[PDB]
Amino acid sequence: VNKLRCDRRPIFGKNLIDLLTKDRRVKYDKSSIIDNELIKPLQTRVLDNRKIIDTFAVLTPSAVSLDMRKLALGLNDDSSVGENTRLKVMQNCFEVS
Amino acid sequence: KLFKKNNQVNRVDLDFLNLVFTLNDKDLTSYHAEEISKLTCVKNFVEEV
Amino acid sequence: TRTAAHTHIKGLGLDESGVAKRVEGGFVGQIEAREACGVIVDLIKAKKMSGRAILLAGGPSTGKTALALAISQELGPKVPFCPLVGSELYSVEVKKTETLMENFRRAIGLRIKETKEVYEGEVTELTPEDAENPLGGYGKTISHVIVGLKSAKGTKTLRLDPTIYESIQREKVSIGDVIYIEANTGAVKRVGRSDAYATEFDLETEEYVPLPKGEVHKKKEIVQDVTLHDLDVANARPQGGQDVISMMGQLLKPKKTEITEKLRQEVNKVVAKYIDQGVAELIPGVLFIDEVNMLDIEIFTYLNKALESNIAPVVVLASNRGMTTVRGTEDVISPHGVPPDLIDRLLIVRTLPYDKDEIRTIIERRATVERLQVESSALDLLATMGTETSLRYALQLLAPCGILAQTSNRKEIVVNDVNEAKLLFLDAKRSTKILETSANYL
Amino acid sequence: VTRTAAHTHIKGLGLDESGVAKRVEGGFVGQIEAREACGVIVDLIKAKKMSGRAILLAGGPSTGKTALALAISQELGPKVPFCPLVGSELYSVEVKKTETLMENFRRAIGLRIKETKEVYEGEVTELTPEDAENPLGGYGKTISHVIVGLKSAKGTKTLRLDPTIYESIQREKVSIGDVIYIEANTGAVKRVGRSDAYATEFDLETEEYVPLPKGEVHKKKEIVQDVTLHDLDVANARPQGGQDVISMMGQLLKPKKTEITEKLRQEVNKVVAKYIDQGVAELIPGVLFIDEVNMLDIEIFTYLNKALESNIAPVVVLASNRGMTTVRGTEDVISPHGVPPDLIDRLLIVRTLPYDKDEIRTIIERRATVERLQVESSALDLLATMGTETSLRYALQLLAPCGILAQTSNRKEIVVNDVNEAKLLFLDAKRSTKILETSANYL
Amino acid sequence: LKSLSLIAAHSHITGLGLDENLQPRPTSEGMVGQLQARRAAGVILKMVQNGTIAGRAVLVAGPPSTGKTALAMGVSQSLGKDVPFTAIAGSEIFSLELSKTEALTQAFRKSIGIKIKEETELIEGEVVEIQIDRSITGGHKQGKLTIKTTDMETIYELGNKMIDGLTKEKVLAGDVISIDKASGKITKLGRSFAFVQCPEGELQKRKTVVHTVSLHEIDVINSRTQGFLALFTGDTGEIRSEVRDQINTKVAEWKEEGKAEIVPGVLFIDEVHMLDIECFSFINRALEDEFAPIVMMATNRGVSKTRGTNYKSPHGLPLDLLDRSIIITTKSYNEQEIKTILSIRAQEEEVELSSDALDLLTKTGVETSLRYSSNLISVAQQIAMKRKNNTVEVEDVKRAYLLFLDSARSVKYVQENESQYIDDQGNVQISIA
Amino acid sequence: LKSLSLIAAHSHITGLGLDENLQPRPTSEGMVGQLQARRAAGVILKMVQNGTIAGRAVLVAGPPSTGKTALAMGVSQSLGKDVPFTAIAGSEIFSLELSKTEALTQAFRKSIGIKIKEETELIEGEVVEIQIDRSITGGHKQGKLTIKTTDMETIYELGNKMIDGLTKEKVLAGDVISIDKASGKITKLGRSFARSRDYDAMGADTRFVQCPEGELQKRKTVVHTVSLHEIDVINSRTQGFLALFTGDTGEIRSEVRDQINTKVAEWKEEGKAEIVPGVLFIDEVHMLDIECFSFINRALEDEFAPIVMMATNRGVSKTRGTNYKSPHGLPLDLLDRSIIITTKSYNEQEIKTILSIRAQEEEVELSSDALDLLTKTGVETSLRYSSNLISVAQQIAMKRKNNTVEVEDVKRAYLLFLDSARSVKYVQENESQYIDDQGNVQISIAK
Ligand SMILES: Nc1ncnc2c1ncn2[C@@H]1O[C@H](COP(=O)(O)OP(=O)(O)O)[C@@H](O)[C@H]1O
Ligand SMILES: Nc1ncnc2c1ncn2[C@@H]1O[C@H](COP(=O)(O)OP(=O)(O)O)[C@@H](O)[C@H]1O
Ligand SMILES: Nc1ncnc2c1ncn2[C@@H]1O[C@H](COP(=O)(O)OP(=O)(O)O)[C@@H](O)[C@H]1O
Ligand SMILES: Nc1ncnc2c1ncn2[C@@H]1O[C@H](COP(=O)(O)OP(=O)(O)O)[C@@H](O)[C@H]1O
Ligand SMILES: [Mg+2]
Ligand SMILES: [Mg+2]
Ligand SMILES: [Mg+2]
Fold first, then answer.
1. Domain containing E128: what range?
2. N or C: lower Cβ tally within 10 Å for chain A?
3. Do E425 and F324 lie within an 8 Å CB cutoff?
4. Where residue F158 sits, what CATH number does that domain have?
5. Shortest CA distance from C7: residue in chain F
């Protein structure tokens, strides 16, 4: 246990984690404006253009292979990955929209 | 499974030897690391021995 | 005072009649480029012209970038100046077209005036609302919070949104903490615990600030200037807020994209509505592009249609070549590295060189700005080095003669100091003459 | 059975203790200076002190440069690491050729380590959280760890594990009465199967029944496993893979290999130098052998100039088969061997000697004895004349079809008509050029 | 209104300026001169306004300072709204992420648009009071409010999504809403008494909405889902042609069913001389397709060597391109037309000029070029403005002439000072003696 | 000292080795000879240490075996810590994913760094006991522990995140913590003795030294050094940090550079951030493109422009990208705005002194006659061949099991390892053996 703790302890961060939040946090304040109403960002450009999407999307990929979506990520009934990798990944996928 | 033969006899883990420290800025600071690696003792298990 | 090949020029230094002086404002000689450059200065002061492109073509050490700092200093801080190099327009995130037209939106400025409301005071109660009706009711809220801000000269209660209340929960405030709340923006800053609760505990990490003087509600007007490209980035992508939805809106897609024309149409539509209300005032600016010969043919051909566009202001170019091959073309040979269609809509201001006495006044006035004392024999020797090696070698050797004067404890530059600068440091032609004789690639 | 492909007839250089090379020894005939000088290079690698030394082998085709490279690679032994490499292989588009070149200089060196690991095994009895039944306030007692009671044959012990190795225990779908294999330092979990006590519970089961592991619960052993320093550099560079989601997604996120900074190598050889200060490891240099150096660019040559001035660059053997030619990447530069004269100044040239008619006869002879074919003397003299007329590689190339025609003609020895039939069915270079000289419509 | 308009070189030209008999006036709508070019451009204008034919290419050639780009600007300005106009550069098709042929196909899909219309219902009226009903534990909100106008006043009960949009977006009794039934989103337009609102008309009205969308947008949208993110970010390229073929049959079926009508747009390519031969043969095929817009080209160079080959082909284009295209040429202008163009640039720039400054500016416009005089008219008002008068004098034009030098004058100065300027071999005399 | 240091060619040179009057000593700090080059390099050293001027380029030229790269190594070694030094190659800027001009701009942003400091609080003290409180169904943990030092002993109540970091990192009563308030992470530094013998196989969180002094809560200042290139790729996009580690960056928009320049100038005006003028060193600058030459000709006149040291190593030849043979291998526009330092050849005694200090660096004991013969063969052939014969001579001596180097080892190392000119004579004598320019080669012996 002495050699285990002597080998365990020198884990030096190469710079810091305070070097990552030091040079990222801006000294300038929030200063909100009509800025936020001016945006219409891209993921809400998907939402605001629902009529053009609903009217102009017609064509379908008429040829597909089923059970290829499960194999492309490696999560199926048998693979090199473990048992709850597909379960925790399918649950974190199941929550994220 | 043919290459999941016995590797751990002739493999080093290489995560115990503090050599994957490129992942160490995710959950460790600088003064946490210097203050954590200044403090590793021999001479207490030598006392109990 | 840091001096790096500049700060000796305080503008062009022209008269009211227009005639340029010989020695005025860190300039010696060069009457046509300074007076014509002042005509360009008045052309920016017209606030009417657009699409005008004037390139400055000349050799090295002739004063093109110094004339660019002369027009940038002659315009003043109220006129926006955008320094830019043609080598900087290459990007892999977006095309060079978006950076070029985006820079054309970076040159223009637009000053606004607006009033905002300021609220401050000591927090008394944080509690949901109850009260009555025109028709009877008993059970009551959706979770908003009345914040009773106790100021010095007044006590008022205000109802807030759940988002600014969420930032109030973020600031970890309590009963008796001085906060700062902006009405129009919604940002929350805490000043600290009030001075009345300083005697509650003997030691506390929270500093004790006094009560803010004045009323609860305050108003003021700002003459803040903000560029139109800053409004375009404000119209393009979310910047960042204090809530989770705004911060994740930033974190999701922070990579900058190309901007469509209809977005700029709505931006200058509501900007034109602001200038129809009399609030804002549109002022053009300057996009100065360094080393135009390094540009690709695509940026040149988009400069052809871009100079035919409306919002493109007076753009000053600087090219230091002649009949050379254009980048991106194989057999096209054109003057200045510029295609002849872009050169047809360009205006050339020829730069004049300098004599021996004008090199002596460049070294002289640069020595007075550099605060070094030069003797007349070393001044004539630096004049002969100015007429033998280069101008930049004599201006480069102004400082080591003063350094050797400091090591030799002398206050003036002597002959042996500049000859020691000739021995310790070599120019171009001595370096080529030495590198001509090679044993194994010397 | 035994596959022979232009090699495996050389078992080293075959030098004496005094240094003088024999004429016929170890699959070599002639070539005394390159073999004895090559043995001086062998001892130079056995010095374990020299670095930055570069010795190129220059000569014509069929002279024995790559055969001398397999002679030094076989003379060094399996304990000395050998890195075969071609100069055409250093071109990469993921990273630069500089990173592959200096990376290969980190691939030549080796470093053997010794370490002890703990081995735990046994039948799983209980998987249950801990109580220590005073609550202490801190918990309605647990944060979810699991005591795993491993029942071995010679002992029964209970052990407390991390939630990650417990998560892999949940991955292996083990239950009460399953034999597992758990490593302490690494944390990897392997299941052997259901124990033999529960074989009579069901008549048919997909889970195989393994016996109980003999011995104690805790076991220790020491390994003399060797691992190259570049393998420690890849181990210091990118995550390889684990049994958890965070490790596998750490692999899946950025698996594309990048360039390595110098400070990372400074920390790697810093803790490696700490391991050699403890007396655990031993640093041994190696060999980077580069084939076809004339195919290299001028950037790899100029990085070889500063790279040979570096410290960790070991004895590197080059092989270039040209002369006063234009360097790749240069227009007017004409230099010997396709190598710039600054790199050729720090290079060492070992001149290769050609072979006579009798030495070609011993090459075909000993290659025929290694190939286990029987050749008559008339066909041996005919293959000697073809060795002195067409090439060496054409006679060594035609050793096998004469035995094939001997097999179809049911003969056990190579005859005159078999090698003349090999002359009719197969043509050499000069007959192919002489035939292609006469063309009706580009013959 | 309110297209962003500062002073451009192409700002004064608004419309082609032709009569009903297509004979051009001398001074009409910013374009003076070039009667045959404006008449033939009017034939192209009624060719686009006809729309019964397609797959035609035209070329506008001529010397510099003739306005072929200004003629195409007059065609695009006289084209009006609701018709797509694509103005790309000749070197714009060269890209690293996108192939030149697929980018040219992307421009050919960008030129033609589709109009699709539908009808929606709208209820606009003043709110009297709002009375929602929910529960402190359960949920299931039950909204009721009253909508009022000049001749109707009724109470509307609300569903779950009406209270979702009614509580996501703050509204009052005084505030007035306008609700679409199909869209489900609320338009809080105005407010009552302290807004704008002052409404008239019926409560529930049905109006038609028309949307214009080009074929390129449908191509990248029907490519994949993230082709919309590639439509905004511009990271598209190399679409499969099954989307183009099935989209062509779907558009033809929409034309046969009468659902979607298309608008034949105009494709304008600037500086088409330095184009690759692969794009030349690709235009030689793509001009014969069914959905092929009218292409206007402006070859600006002279006779030289085409990029991609060794021989000097005439016109800078191969003859396979010029065989299937019509060519309009322009001629030089007279001395009076330069004074007229400088007068209408004085009217566009809002610059008051004198007669003698217009005569000397006309003379130096004939001698040097059109563009140099078209910038000397700009700086002459500012040399005049430094003297604090709006009137432009001849001294300002002479000072602006001696200050701003012509190209040929500094060509003489360069040839006189060749020792000063650096030569082709890099030799330069940076010293004096 | 624990910068990784085996025996390099540039390992013995530690510092420039100059006096206060800038006159160089004959033998000082590993550098012997080149008095004018070391004095002028000391002028460059005090030019960087002054920091009041910028936008200057210098060039160090000379024949081979003179040490211009060793002179720049002495400048970088005498520069000390906290100043950034960028040493790139001339052919390193050529890339396929990155343009050469934007990679040169990336090096020009890599050369200059920024120091930003702030103050944080720290509470370090020995733990007496830990008493947390949670619920079996609800949650909402309520932690209490006691922190003790030599002159203070108090009980600290903990929040939710203190028990989050206190339970996701194992700690005991005997274990001693040091907590930062702003960072919120715990530093389990040392232990007393108490709890080690509870489990045979345990977790991964055990740490013991502690013997603390001082006050409990102390405030100290932390200083971070970050170059402008890092801020450029970080303010480019979010995945520019992943491009900062993986190296998949390139072609940044110049609005980040312009607004970052005005933001850095505003940080200098406000006094928040001070910058350090670093040195940019480019090795083998002769084979550079003319576009990078004109780009240096513009970029030397920028405001944030570091001191550039160049080492032109080739001779007079044809520049890459043009057809004419320009002198020095560089155009005159680059050499006009730059200063040039030249080096000269060494004497016979200085080669013996350099081999003596390489014997001191390599820890090799040499004899007098082996140093004389090694000095003679160092004068005759080259410096580098003798500088490797000193290495192999100790090993030919080591095979005889003595540490003393004899002349027989130097003669054997001379007859074994051949010079370049000797094998040039052997190549010219054996041209029939070696392959010619046209591919002809006599691989046989008789005709
Ligand atoms: N009026 C002036 N007075 C003093 N020095 C000048 C003046 N004009 C230019 N210089 C010198 O010229 C240098 C700038 O040259 P610049 O004109 O930028 O070269 P280029 O023409 O190649 O862009 C500066 O170092 C500055 O000292
Ligand atoms: N001295 C030798 N003894 C035995 N075989 C030889 C000898 N020299 C050449 N060879 C044979 O010639 C063949 C080709 O020679 P190789 O080393 O490939 O030439 P190169 O290095 O020019 O490609 C090898 O397979 C080798 O077996
Ligand atoms: N018919 C016209 N009416 C008015 N202005 C014209 C006319 N023709 C040309 N111009 C002028 O010519 C300029 C455009 O020239 P341009 O077409 O770009 O030259 P090029 O044909 O060489 O590209 C504009 O400033 C415009 O004022
Ligand atoms: N002060 C010195 N005295 C003698 N030899 C030196 C000195 N400095 C360097 N050298 C020799 O020169 C070698 C480095 O040469 P280098 O500068 O790389 O030449 P090049 O740059 O032309 O390739 C060193 O290994 C060393 O042997
Ligand atoms: Mg044109
Ligand atoms: Mg310049
Ligand atoms: Mg070198």
1. 117-210
2. C
3. yes
4. 2.40.50.360
5. F303
